[PDB]
Amino acid sequence: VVVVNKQVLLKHFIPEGAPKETDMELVTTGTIRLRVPEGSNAVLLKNLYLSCDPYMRMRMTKHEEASYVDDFVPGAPITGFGVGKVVDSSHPDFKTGDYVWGLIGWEEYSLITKPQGLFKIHHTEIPLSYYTGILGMVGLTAYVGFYDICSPKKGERVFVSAAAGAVGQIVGQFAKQFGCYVVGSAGSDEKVNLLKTKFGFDEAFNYKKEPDLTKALKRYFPEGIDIYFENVGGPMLEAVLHNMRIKGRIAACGMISQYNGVHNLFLIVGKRIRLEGFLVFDHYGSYPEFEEKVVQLIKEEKIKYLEDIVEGLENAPAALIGLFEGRNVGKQVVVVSREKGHHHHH
Amino acid sequence: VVVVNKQVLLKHFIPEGAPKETDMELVTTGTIRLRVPEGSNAVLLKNLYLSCDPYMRMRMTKHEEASYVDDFVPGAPITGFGVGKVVDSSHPDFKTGDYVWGLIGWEEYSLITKPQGLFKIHHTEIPLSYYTGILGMVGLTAYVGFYDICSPKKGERVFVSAAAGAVGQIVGQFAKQFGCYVVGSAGSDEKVNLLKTKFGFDEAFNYKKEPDLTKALKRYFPEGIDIYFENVGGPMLEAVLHNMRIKGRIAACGMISQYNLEKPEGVHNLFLIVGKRIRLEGFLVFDHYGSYPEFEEKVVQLIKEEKIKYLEDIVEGLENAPAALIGLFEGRNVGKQVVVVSREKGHHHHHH
Numbered sequence: 001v002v003v004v005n006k007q008v009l010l011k012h013f014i015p016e017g018a019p020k021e022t023d024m025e026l027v028t029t030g031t032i033r034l035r036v037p038e039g040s041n042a043v044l045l046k047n048l049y050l051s052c053d054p055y056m057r058m059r060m061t062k063h064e065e066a067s068y069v070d071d072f073v074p075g076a077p078i079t080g081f082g083v084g085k086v087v088d089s090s091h092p093d094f095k096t097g098d099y100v101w102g103l104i105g106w107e108e109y110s111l112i113t114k115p116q117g118l119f120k121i122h123h124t125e126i127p128l129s130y131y132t133g134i135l136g137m138v139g140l141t142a143y144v145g146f147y148d149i150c151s152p153k154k155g156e157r158v159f160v161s162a163a164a165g166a167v168g169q170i171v172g173q174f175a176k177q178f179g180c181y182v183v184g185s186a187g188s189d190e191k192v193n194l195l196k197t198k199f200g201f202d203e204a205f206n207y208k209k210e211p212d213l214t215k216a217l218k219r220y221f222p223e224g225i226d227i228y229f230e231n232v233g234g235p236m237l238e239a240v241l242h243n244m245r246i247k248g249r250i251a252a253c254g255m256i257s258q259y260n261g262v263h264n265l266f267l268i269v270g271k272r273i274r275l276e277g278f279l280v281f282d283h284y285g286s287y288p289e290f291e292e293k294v295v296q297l298i299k300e301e302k303i304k305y306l307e308d309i310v311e312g313l314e315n316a317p318a319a320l321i322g323l324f325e326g327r328n329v330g331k332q333v334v335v336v337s338r339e340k341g342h343h344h345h346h
Numbered sequence: 347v348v349v350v351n352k353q354v355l356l357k358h359f360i361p362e363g364a365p366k367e368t369d370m371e372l373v374t375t376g377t378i379r380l381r382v383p384e385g386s387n388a389v390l391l392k393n394l395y396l397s398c399d400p401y402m403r404m405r406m407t408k409h410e411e412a413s414y415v416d417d418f419v420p421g422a423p424i425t426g427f428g429v430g431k432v433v434d435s436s437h438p439d440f441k442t443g444d445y446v447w448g449l450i451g452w453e454e455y456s457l458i459t460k461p462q463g464l465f466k467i468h469h470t471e472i473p474l475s476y477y478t479g480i481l482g483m484v485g486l487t488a489y490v491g492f493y494d495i496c497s498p499k500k501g502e503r504v505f506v507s508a509a510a511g512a513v514g515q516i517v518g519q520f521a522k523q524f525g526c527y528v529v530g531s532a533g534s535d536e537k538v539n540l541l542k543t544k545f546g547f548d549e550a551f552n553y554k555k556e557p558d559l560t561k562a563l564k565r566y567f568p569e570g571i572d573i574y575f576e577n578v579g580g581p582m583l584e585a586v587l588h589n590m591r592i593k594g595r596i597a598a599c600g601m602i603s604q605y606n607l608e609k610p611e612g613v614h615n616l617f618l619i620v621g622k623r624i625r626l627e628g629f630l631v632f633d634h635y636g637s638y639p640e641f642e643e644k645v646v647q648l649i650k651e652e653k654i655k656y657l658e659d660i661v662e663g664l665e666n667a668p669a670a671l672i673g674l675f676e677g678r679n680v681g682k683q684v685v686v687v688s689r690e691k692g693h694h695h696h697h698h
């Protein structure tokens with residue numbers, strides 16, 4: 001049994017600046033046998049869904065010394081988080097018909113030879129695509145960032161940049177449900193309005209239509225900010241610092257403003273601010289409890305979640321690109337292949 | 347019974363910029379009564395020593411929104427940290443002959459109406475001047491920032507800037523004795539040699555003499571920096587950031603390179619904070635007076651056992667205080683800057 005296997009490859013490395021669709025290429029002639037090798041310690045996956053995540057951009061650029069994650073290889077498939085089904089296994093922990101999530105290939109089928117970086121999916125009542133984000137890497141990020149790095153108290157005043165992004169939207173809800181005052185910022189009036197209507201943010205604003213970020217935060221935060229969940233960085237951070245309260249905390253998840261400086265750092269001393277970067281890579285020990293908490297929320301309908309869904313691998317390169325441009329409304333997902341039988345969608 | 351009471355006053359609020367002598371004025375006509383007001387709850391001090399501290403400059407500028415500390419008032423005496431003797435008292439916890447340290451006037455005698463924010467000195471055997479730095483506010487800063495903010499572990503690689511100053515020279519010794527590798531920067535060869543010889547730092551470097559701070563740190567930290575005790579701010583900070591290890595910590599104690607700039611340096615590589623999982627944490631010694639006792643016990647014993655070294659830079663007479671404060675931002679001070687206002691009755695102590 002030998003089948004077609006479409007692939008998406010890094011065409012070439014790219015310099016400083018912005019990725020483009022043409023940095024990738026779809027190849028359709030390749031094939032793959034539908035068993036694992038004898039004597040292997042591997043899992044063969046039919047790839048169902050793929051996440052486009054902002055961090056992927058970094059991996060298109062060549063690094064002499066190892067950044068946290070290895071660079072993509074020219075002529076080799078793009079990889080990143082996704083969800084898959086075991087077509088075959090020669091590793092004990094995974095059986096034919098199991099569903100998993102983790103780093104897989106941007107292709108129809110992945111022979112994973114490092115199976116220990118996969119996680120079996122225990123709730124199949126939930127749409128599998130959620131394990132690309134809310135129940136995946138993205139949710140875990142929100143969860144660790146917020147509960148751990150921000151040390152929040154019932155009553156504190158929370159600001160979240162890229163609030164309409166996948167992490168941001170989950171942070172915002174965790175925080176409102178913690179008894180916090182929550183304000184997010186975004187790139188669209190469409191998204192500002194989702195933050196308030198769908199996601200239950202107390203206020204929200206479009207950063208692009210604000211000529212003074214510092215005064216912008218002032219209107220929303222008359223007594224200052226306690227907790228900045230930071231996805232953006234740059235002049236946004238300057239403005240947050242200006243507006244931060246005694247003993248404020250900044251969780252430095254990302255600085256997306258910087259992928260494709262700050263002048264008032266000294267305010268950290270006299271306001272006794274804690275600024276701390278964190279990486280969800282270091283925190284997989286918290287997954288299982290994180291999983292049960294967020295599963296309960298969904299079943300209970302105490303959390304809302306929006307996915308931006310694209311259909312088919314060949315659509316993956318533009319979706320990834322749109323992500324960088326803020327074209328995604330909700331967590332960007334690509335459907336490589338839907339598993340058979342069932343939700344409904346509009 | 348009335349005496350002469352010299353005072354240094356703030357003449358005018360100043361703009362963003364460097365301060366100058368002529369921002370303060372000496373006034374020698376003033377007089378003071380040597381008994382607290384009747385019906386008061388107060389302590390009159392004869393002031394013996396004053397500390398020159400960098401945060402003092404910020405107070406010379408008007409601020410519309412309150413900071414941690416209140417501005418100076420023009421035409422009112424400058425105030426800061428010092429050491430005084432109780433001359434008279436209508437407050438029970440303070441008696442005549444008691445020596446104290448706290449916030450006092452830049453003057454010969456101060457009538458303290460909030461005696462609650464005074465510390466009585468229990469160890470009069472140690473030179474009183476130490477309670478302006480090592481056993482005062484400054485010593486506690488080193489203690490809290492290093493032992494608490496830095497979360498150090500044996501073997502860690504520690505970088506301290508303004509390492510030959512009041513705070514840094516102490517932090518380095520804490521760090522050395524904690525079992526850490528310790529490197530400092532200072533603004534001269536004199537300082538550098540002090541760091542290596544007197545203070546036991548593993549390495550030191552004259553930062554004014556490095557064309558590349560990033561590469562300078564790379565020389566001393568071939569495996570990178572675990573902990574950085576931030577006294578300085580500015581491009582040293584970025585150079586540290588580039589050189590910092592995974593899970594590195596930065597205790598933002600102060601950023602003195604910035605205090606006299608109308609326009610502050612931008613730091614450009616904060617992003618590293620993410621992939622290196624760094625904590626950059628500011629703190630204020632004012633919120634930590636709770637720690638004093640454990641700290642005082644620990645440090646008085648170190649001093650008594652000569653297990654910690656300490657250099658003061660002494661300037662004689664209240665009159666030389668303005669120039670001494672100004673000298674801090676050019677790094678004239680070599681050790682902790684102290685001004686001797688009036689040296690207590692009873693010293694029989696030699697120096698060079």
Ligand SMILES: NC(=O)c1ccc[n+]([C@@H]2O[C@H](COP(=O)([O-])OP(=O)(O)OC[C@H]3O[C@@H](n4cnc5c(N)ncnc54)[C@H](OP(=O)(O)O)[C@@H]3O)[C@@H](O)[C@H]2O)c1
Binds near residue numbers: 185326
């Ligand atoms: N540290 C970790 O372990 C970890 C793990 C996962 C994710 N993250 C980080 O969390 C952040 C958001 O993640 P996500 O997956 O939830 O992303 P996302 O929101 O699904 O997508 C990126 C969003 O960022 C905003 N954006 C794009 N370019 C921008 C610019 N130049 N200036 C300001 N905003 C811009 C856009 O929204 P607007 O319409 O709001 O502009 C866009 O929708 C990223 O910084 C990412 O690197 C960190």
Ligand SMILES: NC(=O)c1ccc[n+]([C@@H]2O[C@H](COP(=O)([O-])OP(=O)(O)OC[C@H]3O[C@@H](n4cnc5c(N)ncnc54)[C@H](OP(=O)(O)O)[C@@H]3O)[C@@H](O)[C@H]2O)c1
Binds near residue numbers: 577601675
């Ligand atoms: N957060 C708190 O609670 C707290 C409490 C006390 C002190 N502090 C801070 O801790 C730091 C150290 O204070 P200290 O009392 O120990 O002062 P200090 O080091 O005894 O005196 C100041 C020294 O800073 C250095 N310096 C001056 N201008 C500089 C510049 N433009 N660039 C680089 N270095 C410069 C000079 O030494 P060089 O010869 O090396 O240039 C100068 O001798 C200060 O930044 C102060 O604000 C904070």
Ligand SMILES: COc1cc(/C=C/C=O)ccc1O
Binds near residue numbers: 400599601632
């Ligand atoms: C201006 O910020 C500072 C405050 C202090 C004193 C802090 C006491 O808790 C010292 C140096 C500074 O730069």
